[PDB]
Design a protein around this nucleic acid. Sequence first.
DNA 1: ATTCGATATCGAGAATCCCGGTGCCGAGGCCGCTCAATTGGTCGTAGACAGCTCTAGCACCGCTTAAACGCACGTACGCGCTGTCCCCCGCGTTTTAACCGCCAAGGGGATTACTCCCTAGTCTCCAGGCACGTGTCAGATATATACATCCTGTGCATGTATTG
DNA 2: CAATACATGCACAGGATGTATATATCTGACACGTGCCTGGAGACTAGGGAGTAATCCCCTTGGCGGTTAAAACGCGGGGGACAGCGCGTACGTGCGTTTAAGCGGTGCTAGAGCTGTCTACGACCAATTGAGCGGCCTCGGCACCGGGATTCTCGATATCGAAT
Lengths: 96, 95, 82, 80, 102, 98, 111, 106, 109
Amino acid sequence: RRKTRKESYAIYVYKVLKQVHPDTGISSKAMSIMNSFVNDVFERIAGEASRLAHYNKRSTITSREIQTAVRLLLPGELAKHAVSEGTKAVTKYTSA
Amino acid sequence: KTRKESYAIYVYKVLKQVHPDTGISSKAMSIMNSFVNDVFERIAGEASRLAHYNKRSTITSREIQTAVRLLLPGELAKHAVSEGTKAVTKYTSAK
Amino acid sequence: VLRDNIQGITKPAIRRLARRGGVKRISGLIYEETRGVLKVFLENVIRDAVTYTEHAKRKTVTAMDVVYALKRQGRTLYGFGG
Amino acid sequence: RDNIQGITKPAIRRLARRGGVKRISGLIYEETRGVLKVFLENVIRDAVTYTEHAKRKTVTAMDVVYALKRQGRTLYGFGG
Amino acid sequence: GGVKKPHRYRPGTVALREIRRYQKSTELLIRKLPFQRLVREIAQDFKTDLRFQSSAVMALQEASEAYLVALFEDTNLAAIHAKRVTIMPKDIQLARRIRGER
Amino acid sequence: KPHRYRPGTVALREIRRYQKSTELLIRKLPFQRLVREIAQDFKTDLRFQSSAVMALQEASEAYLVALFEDTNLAAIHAKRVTIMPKDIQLARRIRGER
Amino acid sequence: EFALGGRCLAFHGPLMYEAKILKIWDPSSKMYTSIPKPQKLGEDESIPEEIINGKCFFIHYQGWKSSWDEWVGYDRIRAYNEENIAMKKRLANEAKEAKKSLLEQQKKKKL
Amino acid sequence: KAKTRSSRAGLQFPVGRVHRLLRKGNYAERVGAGAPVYLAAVLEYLTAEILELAGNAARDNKKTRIIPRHLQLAVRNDEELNKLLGRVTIAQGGVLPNIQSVLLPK
Amino acid sequence: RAKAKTRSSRAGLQFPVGRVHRLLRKGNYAERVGAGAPVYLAAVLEYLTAEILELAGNAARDNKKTRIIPRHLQLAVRNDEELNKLLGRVTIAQGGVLPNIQSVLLPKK
DNA sequence: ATTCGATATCGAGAATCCCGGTGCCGAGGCCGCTCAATTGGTCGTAGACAGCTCTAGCACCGCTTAAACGCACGTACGCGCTGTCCCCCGCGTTTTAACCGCCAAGGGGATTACTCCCTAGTCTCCAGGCACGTGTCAGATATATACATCCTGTGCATGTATTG
DNA sequence: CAATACATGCACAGGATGTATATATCTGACACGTGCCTGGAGACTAGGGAGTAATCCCCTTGGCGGTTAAAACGCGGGGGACAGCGCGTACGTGCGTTTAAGCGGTGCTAGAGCTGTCTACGACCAATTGAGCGGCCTCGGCACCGGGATTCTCGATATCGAAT
């Protein structure tokens, strides 16, 4: 038969690699490392987001509690840069 | 709302079931309430996981039997599985 | 603005905390760098607590948010709500 | 059985040399095998419990990293 | 002739006596006001003019004592590790190293 | 007289060798036989995927190299270079699994 | 002279010690004045009869606890003045010479 | 006449609120009937053991009311709770009365 | 019906916003998820991947390599202390360790 | 001035680095499918906001006494050093099973299909849990003895060093 | 060579001393009575997730032959581990002094908390399509190999500092 789809971020990781390094290759095992990475950190931040929304008695995931949480997990260097481009991405998303 | 919801009288009654002569401190009682809330969160979170984790989507007795043998250390486990199984047996017998 | 209270963790109090731990004899330069240890632990705890605080549009740090943040970092506390 | 002694003395030396240890006592090896094996029944007990949850009686690497995820240590590149 | 001499104990008897005294105690061993000053001065550069519940600051108090005393038994073990009874700054550096927050 | 290094120089050389390397330092079939015999008591007639025992291999070597770094720190603590077991029972005790 | 709460130097064996005067006793009135007011001796309070006919002072030794507090007469008490301080230094030197003789006899005992 | 689910299950812990905490507490969109029953059962079991050990501690400390010092002795004397809740610090517990042997006088 | 434009290109991102929104919904975190939440989530995932990939690229470059190996990833994540608390309790397969020697283990003169 | 130890250098050995060479199989791009993202419209409803209340948190102040600080004497550990022993590194030979690889077989993981048991959802009812009030005894506080117990002297059991 | 006093090491008396124990007392948090209201329970329906039959295939298991890198055993020896000792100093302990924490009282307010509105906004469902994933196929980065250079190591002879 034709097998079911397995969820992976491989093509996006490849193209952001090309954005940061247009000539650098990638191996498959390292790419699976990266997929496990993005799944793990996404689960961490999404669990923190869902909790911190529940914890103040709120039933809606928004951008505010996840900028709060990204700042919770990611440390300073991984923080102000992340929150800054996140807000400009959100504003350019709502602008369009 | 103004109503605040906690396991006060329930832990009091199981205490009287164990020791029908012993008092309890209120901050000790908050220790008990936060403790049962925390272990409830751990057991429910892992049960929701291992229900998701085999592509299931409903919460029944089998996975929480699995998770109570899994989380709690062994000694507490087999007895917890025994009492939970006889409890659900009583529940289905009484419908 | 309050300033220069870091010495407020007094020398006998650091001793008393040690003597609950069961140690006998205390080195002399323990006190100031253990005050620094309290400083780093309290700063990351209070960072998580004030982050939880300002998410709730709040200007008051709640004990709820304190035990919340302790649940986050692996140093959780009991007796103040779940 | 005998396979607990299959974790040989040069192998434990290799682990120490990756661990940056210069000199190793002779009594390291057997109780290090004990530490290894107790870590093993903890992890594989969690992994097998995941395994007969799935109505399964062969184990997967996915269940292994899943048991690690429970025990706290996270492994990458083995799925999940 | 016979000159007096006080009732000073050997160094260590008073030690172990207050060890048994304090390992049965349950109260707080830091004074509330200085540690509250610590909490209020640390929560300045994060944000100004905070308010703290009286239960919140004492939760910080007792949590910090729990962390410090738990650091102190394995500090004692690290001091005994080098066949010593004096603890040293290296002991707690190693403790925080092996916990994984260094 | 044949050339012989002093005790420790070869040891540091293959510190460097096993630290720049990434391959897996336990013989695969003895570890597989270990995993089978230690899974035997939990369930009889249990089958293991090859990637599963690879995952146990990688996790075990990571656990032991971390524990042995901790061992080297607690050994260099007591004015020493050689480790003893008592080093690693303290290393496990302070990490909270004894 | 002697005042309530003032410094004094007193005998104690062969040596001089500084003390606080907490009570002043008058033998004629069978009474003493104290510091936080005349009053008589209490139920558990007594003065040795060797000095109770002379003017007594209840004194507290500095650097030593309240178990060492005691009644002393003019024989055992002197005012805190430079003559008494100087002979206190002299008797401290005598105690130092006694300790040095102790060291000499123990080092000859070792040999 | 309406009977509670706990008396159906023979428990003192309530099936109703723990079912509601499963539902609005946002763990799964669907939950069966027997899961809160089993959940309340295991909560009763663990609560009974910790309270019975606390009662033993209170008897040994000859106090007729539970104090968190008794709770701390209950959780720390039992080694199984010591890796169930050795991760956990509790309020007003103190520590175990332990002295290392080298610190004892000779 | 207008031309179908991806949400990632609408927000100037490369991780799929619709896919991570589907993972938020089907991953059972709540019954309701806001619109900009997967956008921001995708963006912070982009940021983390951007730093870890450029560090892996530097790890490949000083090793005179052009393909990323898990050893490059391990060196990249262990060389940065902030990623080191992020990934400290995490283990990397075929990663090895940092080459480090404590001081007294060196030979003396 | 003489001898000796630490260091200083030369040279041999040896493990690894770097340069070609050669073959190899994962990897990146092309192609085809297919199904979840996207558009669009609606509909319920959840949170933002305004507003009112009231509670405990902040600030001050005034008396306390427990503690903080400081200092002085002492003694017991920390550590620097040395001697000695024994235990583990290093190297060689022998063994042995790890690994490749090759094939046979079959066991269950995964997928499809069906049919049905249970559960979300809704409405109605009712009683159990919680906010509130009180009275009341378990335990805190204080005070006076009892007793472990700590320290030290001093007094006797035993090694022993000197002497007759 | 024996004794005996002396020195060194247990046994015990005794005084401080701090802590456990007995008793009064009060007091305030524990527990028990009440009202209620909202959330759990009773009943019925939809429908859909899940249990069970089939199947196939692929991926795991078992075994058999060769080869070899690695394991095991052993000899030696040199480097640590560990015991002992001495000296200094660094807190240990204790007493006196300051002081600031701690309790009670007081007020005030800012900010937490509850209620109403309603409008933005996400949930849900039909179309559809373009991205994303399964398969295939070449190729070049890379794995393996071999030879010269480089760096490191280690041990045998000159040379300066140190003691006598």
